[PDB]
Design a binder for this molecule. Structure first.
Ligand SMILES: Nc1nc2c(nc(Br)n2[C@@H]2O[C@H](CO)[C@@H](O)[C@H]2O)c(=O)[nH]1
Ligand SMILES: Nc1nc2c(nc(Br)n2[C@@H]2O[C@H](CO)[C@@H](O)[C@H]2O)c(=O)[nH]1
Ligand SMILES: Nc1nc2c(nc(Br)n2[C@@H]2O[C@H](CO)[C@@H](O)[C@H]2O)c(=O)[nH]1
Ligand SMILES: Nc1nc2c(nc(Br)n2[C@@H]2O[C@H](CO)[C@@H](O)[C@H]2O)c(=O)[nH]1
Ligand SMILES: Nc1nc2c(nc(Br)n2[C@@H]2O[C@H](CO)[C@@H](O)[C@H]2O)c(=O)[nH]1
Ligand SMILES: Nc1nc2c(nc(Br)n2[C@@H]2O[C@H](CO)[C@@H](O)[C@H]2O)c(=O)[nH]1
Lengths: 231, 231, 231, 231, 231, 231
């Protein structure tokens, strides 16, 4: 595989997908037993290890549809990965999305052309794998972790003169990130399972920041939910 | 309201949405107590009645994004309707979608331009209200009704020289109907709740028909699921 | 035929196409001899009968490109229908379109994606069959019925936050309805003949309503023109 | 006016619009009394003269939407031109369009982006002014000149690897030229009157050429029809 | 060749491409030895002659993507033309583009659909042939003629209610003309060499005109640069 | 600045832009004096150091329009960067592009929607800053490094079922990468200077790989050209 320097078997059925390869390192080393690094290519670290005696891998994706598509493609095609879970965050675009909320994306809107390229006059709506979604949801409820289930917006431009998120907020969209559409689309295409779990980095519309302590907590809940949504 | 001849209060918080106004009549009269017809405009019958002592209405929608949008718009704007549930069927486009399956749409793809008109370079992904979805799902599981959760395709043309459903099947899309995108989009826009529950009228790709008896059963399960997903 | 429960021969060469299936019933029973109903499917009534000893049928279409396309498709493919005439109304978008005017559409603009789906980078301009147009025009002139000949706009959304009709008015477009583009496109594709004849339900831009009496008259003139444009 | 070197009044209410400025010269000098040339700018000759004691002008347009738009724009804006009549030819794309036929375009399809630029998600259908159309039609019938009334295709590329005219033929489109959409669109926008009258230069699909003698005749009929459609 | 009445060999490897066929005549007769006119078709004059003992031709193109595409297509396909150089002018859309500047276009933006037709979801960026570009640049520098190298905008509409040139100026685009995209695209497609050299007819945004004397000079420099960029 | 943890002044006027943050480290440490790392955020290392007594920085960009846009945006907005030079490689899509060639992109095509989002019906052609281009070209020629000047294709999908590069090759496009369009577009928008210099990682169409030794050499020439194109 071109972008991942690993061997047959070095990668688990379940990969967790942060955007930052340093959060990849942090996650593995903080949460997992007998950790191994399998990829050092391009600094986009991946790691396999164990959680409750079950194998789990953690691969960085980079930022943007185009970067994540690369990793998801190779993970699926070259390493027969079965379940794929994005664990990152997003800018919240609604007031009712609270900074302690954990978002489970049923679907994703986008200004990426990726789907228009393949489909033309169809708006393809990507779709989370429901069984993973239900699991993650259950895992949250049973521990009373605050959870919201709805849609997000996979953007191409972080800095965006022509942002239409105001209109997206008005249609119930929860927050904007930059990966989900690609994950959900590529996974479904290959008959695989995928889900994005997200925390709120800030409220983008009402301006305000969230604190370091608030981020640590919700981060930690995201990884918890992800892990138990699986074991 | 232009298309519905009813009075303030004559319509419930929860409306069920068949496409056929004669299935609207059938549903109400078969399932509901002390039934009343409130709309005779254009033959697109609507009915309010009672189920387990709780008010429920049933309004026909017509076929197509443009027709349902009319009814959904008026129901929401003129009659402050809170929950909206499409109960119809669809052509299945995958082999693994069985003729006894009951489909709960998390989202919908489309070749309707309705969203491109409002959004331009965004693929808007419509999103089912999750709380209704979960309810309907639970209601099925607890009675052991076979249920599938995924996406569908809201088409504009029934007869379609340029059908791309083959490609849609390959991405996990379950079946094609002609209403969901509109329901989900208009509902979310108005901060309301919506869901499409669907049965399989036929397999469109593998050609074969389903029998009258198979349709009666699954139909009956759809209305059951809808009702209990609410009470 | 899937949507029409009729037998070979039960449907005439010339079908008149109201949107409302109750105007279908009204028209037939008010204007035609030895009337027969051939379709009760979905409440979308169709009727064959006689006018001046010549067979004429009247089929409801529903509202929207997607609904009418269904009926037009089946009428053409399953019942070898030769001439198709939409008789409905429209919202007028110009001041010079008077509430007593009868509109004959030479062509139609649209925000439906139906043609973009089939054609891509082509703006397909649908085209009325001229021989029917000329007839209808003659039939009006010879009785001195006020008649206007120009274009309309086939819309997808009745209620439309992103309405561009102001700009359409400025280019001479007369009024907005929701069926013509589909009729004209499907008819021409099958080497058949089609025409939309329309009355003014209201002025949409200058706001004002038209009265019940004004509508009865112009309605009656529309059906007159349609019938004589044929006999 | 930038592209036309003429003075207030030097140009008539009725301008005839060939594409070739040498057919402009030919037309005027062959058909008109006391001829005057008013424009020599860019070689795109225009001429005013008299026909049956009534003033008529004849201005070359060039080939393509972009060129004709220039001349039509200036003629309308700078010289208050009221009626505009394209007299050129086209490649026929249907077998039933005979080489002696004279085409009156009710409307025009296009791959020009001109309308998509102004309108976005609307397919704008340009529309001939009916009163001119009727006149031209009458003028043909009364002299028994063979005449067809339908649509054409305004193309951007003469030589076209991606030609979709095969599909356009199947929808009843008669022939392809390169000016009409622009004429009809700009004229209607300015509350003016326009019409394209066309002869068949060749059959494009069935390959075959038409002879010099056949072209002279039909040409001559086109100019005849145009003139009498006015006097 | 359909649009050019010339014989095998009558046209040089290097053709200069003004838009005006009268500037074509002027150029040849002012700059070239033993001049011959080979095309009189449609008034779009072409001329072959000699400059410093080397053959050079000069063909008018008309205005617009669609017109120039015709001439470029035939010149390339029918007369095996190798180098093609547009010598015209443009409206400047930036303050820093001075009225004495000579523009060499590396590339061109457009609202023509020509490339979208062939490519769909790709923005094709046309590309000047660099060897010609470098030559022309050198030829300017060595004589100290003021020269700017950047991009332009090939527009379809001269008069443009929906002009986006303000936004184009902000991205460094230098000026607007109506031919370059077509030249560069068709030339590259046929493995040929092309370049647009342009003078400033006016500043379009800041309104002001340039004088007749300023135009004569820069014109003369354009033709100079073109010729020496070749000998 | 959100994505780069550096202080005012820590970053030079001239930044070199590899995609791989490990090639960023390699480049700096191999080519530059008194090297300093200023960014460790996300593993996307940036470094400032000295070359021939002049300050030069080297920042990784990630893969894809969306990732590079982030870094370019911050570098320009937060650190007033003046010149930006992408030094990476690309898949060659033409036979005449030799594995030892060094590509200087005058412009870039794309299937990214980034520009369509901002521009709509315009194909925006991004444009390299010519002064940097000329420098880099000169620097190559004077040392006799093999250099090609033309266009490339900025793709969104590395793995691409719907690849149109075959058609792009036919129009002279040299190779496909994933960053240039974004660089050139964002740089020009902010009145800055940018250039992509590229080596050939493989021939994508004719299949064959290039060797490790061939890559080391051309890589080394790319960095050489970049540096001297500046000093
Ligand atoms: N567009 C956008 N992306 C965001 C935002 N906050 C975050 Br964390 N992201 C994510 O973080 C990366 C860029 O910061 C991308 O992967 C996004 O998924 C935001 O406020 N806006
Ligand atoms: N496009 C499409 N629509 C279908 C199909 N089967 C059914 Br029931 N429908 C639904 O039935 C109506 C038309 O028959 C529309 O509302 C659709 O929701 C099908 O096989 N294809
Ligand atoms: N969009 C639109 N459609 C209209 C209007 N008035 C009428 Br009657 N219609 C027609 O009536 C149906 C919806 O009311 C559609 O079939 C349209 O053809 C109007 O003011 N606007
Ligand atoms: N695209 C196209 N245009 C044609 C054709 N025949 C003729 Br005459 N034209 C017209 O002639 C000019 C180019 O030859 C354009 O103005 C068109 O209006 C044809 O076969 N194809
Ligand atoms: N759109 C546009 N085209 C221009 C302008 N100035 C000139 Br000279 N042109 C060129 O001149 C012709 C129309 O006047 C076209 O070929 C353009 O190349 C201008 O200010 N705007
Ligand atoms: N699409 C594409 N990108 C390529 C290729 N070879 C290379 Br190195 N790249 C570049 O390398 C990264 C992905 O491998 C992207 O940044 C591209 O710029 C190729 O053959 N195809």
């Amino acid at each position: 595989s071109v972008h991942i320097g690993a061997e047959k078997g070095q990668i688990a059925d379940t990969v967790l997908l942060p955007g930052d390869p340093l959060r990849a390192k942090f996650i593995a080393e903080t949460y997992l037993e007998n950790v191994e690094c399998y990829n050092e290519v391009r600094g986009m670290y991946g790691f396999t290890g164990t959680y409750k005696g079950k194998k789990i891998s953690v691969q960085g994706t980079g930022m943007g549809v185009p970067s994540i598509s690369i990793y998801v493609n190779e993970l699926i095609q070259s390493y027969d990965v079965q379940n794929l879970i994005r664990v990152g965050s997003c800018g919240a675009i609604r007031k009712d999305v609270k900074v302690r909320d954990v978002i489970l994306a049923m679907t994703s809107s986008t200004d990426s052309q990726m789907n228009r390229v393949a489909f033309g006059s169809v708006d393809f709506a990507p779709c989370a794998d429901f069984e993973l979604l239900k699991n993650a949801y259950d895992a949250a409820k049973d521990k009373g972790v605050p959870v919201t289930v709805g849609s997000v917006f996979t953007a191409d431009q972080f800095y965006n003169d022509d942002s239409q998120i105001e209109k997206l907020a008005k249609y119930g969209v929860l927050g904007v990130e930059m990966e989900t559409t690609a994950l959900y689309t590529l996974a479904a295409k290959h008959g695989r399972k995928a889900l994005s779990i997200l925390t709120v980095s800030d409220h983008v519309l009402t301006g305000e920041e969230t604190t370091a302590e608030e981020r640590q907590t919700t981060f930690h809940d995201m990884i918890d939910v992800a892990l138990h949504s699986v074991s």
